[PDB]
């Protein structure tokens, strides 16, 4: 029939959010110029 | 007839010998490993 009347979006929050980060190394290159 | 008896080589020395050197820049590159 018709379109929706609303828009529902499930939301949630964890006990804690974060990020692990492993360093791969700097990148350096000499070029023309 | 036969082969040579000696071997002559012209030798010479300038008033001064040397070298001019222009620096082009260091070369650095990161690679696998």
UniProtKB/TrEMBL annotation, chains A, B:
Subcellular location field: Virion
Transmembrane annotation, as ranges: none
Higher taxonomy: Viruses, Riboviria, Orthornavirae, Pisuviricota, Pisoniviricetes
Portion of the full-length sequence here: 28 to 60 of 235
The organism's place on the tree of life at top rank: Viruses
Record-stated family: Belongs to the icosahedral plant coat protein family.
Protein name: Capsid protein
Record organism: Ryegrass mottle virus
Span of the signal peptide: none
Gene: ORF4
């Amino acid at each position: 029939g018709q379109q929706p009347t609303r828009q529902v979006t499930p939301v949630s929050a964890p006990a804690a959010m974060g990020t692990q980060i492993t360093y791969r190394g700097p990148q350096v290159v000499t070029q023309y110029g």
